[PDB]
Amino acid sequence: WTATSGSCKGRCFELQEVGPPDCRCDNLCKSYSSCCHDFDELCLKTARGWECTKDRCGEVRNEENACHCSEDCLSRGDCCTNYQVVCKGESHWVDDDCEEIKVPECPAGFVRPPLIIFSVDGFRASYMKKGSKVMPNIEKLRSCGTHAPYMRPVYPTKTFPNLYTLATGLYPESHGIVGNSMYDPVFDASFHLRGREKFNHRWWGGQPLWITATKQGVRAGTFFWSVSIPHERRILTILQWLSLPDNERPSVYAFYSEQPDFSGHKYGPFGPEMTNPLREIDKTVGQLMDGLKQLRLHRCVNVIFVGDHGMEDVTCDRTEFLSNYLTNVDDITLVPGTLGRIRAKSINNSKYDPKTIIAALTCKKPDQHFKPYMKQHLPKRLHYANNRRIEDIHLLVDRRWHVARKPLDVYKKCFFQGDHGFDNKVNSMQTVFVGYGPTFKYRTKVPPFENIELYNVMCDLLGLKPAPNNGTHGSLNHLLRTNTFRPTMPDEVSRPNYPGIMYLQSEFDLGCTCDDKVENKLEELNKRLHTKGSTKERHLLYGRPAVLYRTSYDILYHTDFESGYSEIFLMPLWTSYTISKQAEVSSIPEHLTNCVRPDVRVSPGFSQNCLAYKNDKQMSYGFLFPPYLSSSPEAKYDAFLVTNMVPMYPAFKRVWAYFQRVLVKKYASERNGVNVISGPIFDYNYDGLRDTEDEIKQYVEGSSIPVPTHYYSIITSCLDFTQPADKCDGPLSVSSFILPHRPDNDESCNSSEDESKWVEELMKMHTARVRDIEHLTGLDFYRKTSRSYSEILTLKTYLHTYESEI
Ligand SMILES: *[C@@H]1O[C@H](CO)[C@@H](O[C@@H]2O[C@H](CO)[C@@H](O[C@@H]3O[C@H](CO[C@H]4O[C@H](CO)[C@@H](O)[C@H](O[C@H]5O[C@H](CO)[C@@H](O)[C@H](O)[C@@H]5O[C@H]5O[C@H](CO)[C@@H](O)[C@H](O)[C@@H]5O)[C@@H]4O)[C@@H](O)[C@H](O[C@H]4O[C@H](CO)[C@@H](O)[C@H](O)[C@@H]4O)[C@@H]3O)[C@H](O)[C@H]2NC(C)=O)[C@H](O)[C@H]1NC(C)=O
Ligand SMILES: CC(=O)Nc1ccc(C#Cc2ccc(F)cc2)cn1
Ligand SMILES: [Ca+2]
Ligand code: NA
Ligand code: NA
Ligand SMILES: [Zn+2]
């Protein structure tokens, strides 16, 4: 019940919402059916439109008008945004040359430059070039301020998961808005786009920017706007709030536009109908900047122009139906469209079986436009698993397609030509970023970055301490003229041991054998230097990775590679090696095929053993430093040490062997040498974070050798590829991946072909940021370079996407 019988007199768009059943006058009351009776009359005036004309100049104040052109409107803070232009001979902000804003130029009583976030729904990155003719205010913000060629959204590339990521710095799996439709089995409640359930606070996790601000005593404008409040009124409300007295005035504001997403759904991203919504957005930006200039705030306010996601071409006739694959279609609930999520229709039917649902959906038709995944097998870069609201079965849908349960769902539920929600690496889903103001750089282009990074920067812009989030604070310092945050390297928690020769061969009973007794002060002086770290500067280019947790591990040096060997996990945490452009690939000699050699630096009790692999019929083994890339026949023996061995399913060895035999050398040829760091990952609870040993769910049968869920590599080279990787004077270039360690290659529909047709395609799909590998391993990489730490943080958040150029 709301006793809507109170009044909005002097309360229009009041900043704190008043508790039921007193009636509300805040920018969200319309959404809750709870506004006072006079809200429309008082708060949504429209008389006379939004622009001053010649004849209203100096008019007698008439309180009915939407905005005012009377002489007092500046002191009252409610002129039309073009007031000074029409009635005082002033120029529009877009007509003025840009002039660097070196310092904030603020009216008295402003303690800090305000931040205004102008968020646009569906604003695809290429609109900045393609619509440039019809967006002069936006093109000025972009060319005068700081801009990226595009900004990567999070998955799924839907509206609320992305806007709430902007507000919290968290992945959707952590903030909890994981789609535009959700079931929470703990609440036993559902969230939908239409409805009042979506307003319940318990859907919304983390701490959004407005709550961070408020807790730290910075006032905030209310971010959410009811759909029927027109854009001109949203802008005028923000400008009026900007005229409040110092003690009441917010420092942070948001504007939001439903366009161009609205029209994009109907007409497609580049439909001829799309020119007008882009014109109209630009004109709204023009109103804001003219209003700020009127208030003398246009060289004081930081303005962010930011999208939530792009828009792709999608039509009714590109729909795949689960009824064309499954017979039990009525025993499932599908969340449909640009991604799929599948669960059982009833918790009381124990015949529904996820494993056979997946198998019925896997590589079933030659041109199949979706791929089913258990959520924990999705590419780790999506970070889309660790939330009870995400269903175990997921369908990644090819761009341009939908998935639906039954054809009837599509014509009885064509109507649309655009949609979004696809994989966040897809070029059509990329969106925009522009920062303009005293704290942003002048005329600067920065590389593309992910939207999870903005919350930190918005906190920096406001002098706030960010709540814990998924951004890497300092990675976007290069966007800012000042207020940068000066990160420091995490402290190493565990220091390594440097073991020497301590064990005789006969102490090992590992059931390993090698044909190596086919056995000189010239070459034994050398073996010794190699085991002391004499070639370490060649293979360890950026320092040893730091171990950020408590553990026991050994550095092991070799001619061709260096490793950090875990006495707890019985395998390396990392193995580092450099392949120059000139390197040669050799084979594994026939007599060495099954060779495994005890490492006399590491005790039997902390080594793997060969008998465990012999007795584990499902599990085989691979090596981290590959024998194919040994620098000489004698160095090759080092590659067969039991301390370089890791457990691998046979199906996985197919991938790993191709990467190591063919692709490392291809990359070294293309990139003028590479440094590779590879290693195992254990993430059995799929939370994106390194497992402790007591979380391991699978071991090599009858042993304490844990089986990894993934294997990573980080491949680093010189950004200026005229310089060799091992002799690089400036910025680095990196690509990385996190390959799932699976017992089948069901993910790859072409796997029965030659590895040259499918392996690299798999690796690309599992591309990753160094930062993702850091979370998964508790390691910190690049600790010793000649680069600034901020630059290294930007490199660690880089993602190599393999899309073509936008
Ligand atoms: C990305 O960035 C985020 C934020 O830093 C990281 O997420 C954090 O991870 C840590 C480590 O796991 C979590 O710590 C654990 O927290 C609980 C306390 O839980 C409450 O307090 C915090 C702090 O205010 C809240 O933010 C929590 O909010 C979660 O739950 C509510 C629902 O209750 C929901 O509204 C939120 O959306 C959010 O859900 C997500 O997180 C939970 C787990 O917390 C997860 O189940 C869910 O799927 C969602 O993803 C919450 O109200 C504490 O009890 C734990 O202690 C236990 O473990 C120790 C081990 O030391 C045991 O000894 C002990 O007995 C306990 O059992 C943890 O400390 C932290 O909550 C979490 N924060 C958020 C906001 O998610 C991610 O890890 C980052 N991702 C990557 C890849 O880096
Ligand atoms: C009817 C309807 O949907 N209204 C609506 C929806 C969303 C928003 C937002 C937002 C936002 C989040 C994070 C930001 F950093 C900036 C803006 C405002 N109004
Ligand atoms: Ca984990
Ligand atoms: Na052997
Ligand atoms: Na085996
Ligand atoms: Zn949309």
SS (H, E, C) 588-628: CCHHHCCCCECCCCCCHHHCCCHHHHHHCCCCEEEECCCHH
Single-letter residue type at 447: P
* Residue 115, token pair as written in the block: 């931040």
Cβ partners under 8 Å of residue 166, min gap 6? 117, 119, 306, 308, 451, 454, 455
Name which of 174, 158, 256, 248 is nearest 208 in CA terms: 174
Q: Is 323 exposed, middle or buried (0-12, 13-18, 19+ CB in 10 A)?
A: middle
Strand arrangement, sheet containing 553-557? 553-557, 562-566, 571-579, 674-681, 710-718, 732-740, 767-768
Q: Is 565 exposed, middle or buried (0-12, 13-18, 19+ CB in 10 A)?
A: buried
Residue 353 alpha carbon to ligand 4 centre in Å: 42
Pocket test for ligand 1, best of 164, 174, 191, 774 (most atoms within 8 A of CB): 174
Are the C-beta atoms of 573 and 566 separated by less than 8 Å?
A: yes
DSSP state of 794: H
Q: How far apart are the first and last CA of the chain?
A: 52
Annotated catalytic sites, by residue?
Answer: 159
Would the CB of 117 count as within 6 Å of ligand 2? yes
Residue 704 alpha carbon to ligand 1 centre in Å: 29
| CA-CA-CA-CA torsion sign (15, 43, 164, 194) | positive
Q: How far is CA 638 from the centre of its chain?
A: 39
Would the CB of 173 count as within 6 Å of ligand 1? yes
Residue at token pair 């124990």:
350
Would the CB of 175 count as within 6 Å of ligand 1? yes
Q: Residues in the chain, how many? A: 806
Helices 275-294 and 136-144: crossing angle in degrees, nearest 10, is 60
CA distance 412 to 409: 5
Annotated binding residue at 265? yes
The resolution in angstroms reads 1.9
Would the CB of 459 count as within 6 Å of ligand 2? no
Cβ partners under 8 Å of residue 473, min gap 6? 456, 466, 485, 487
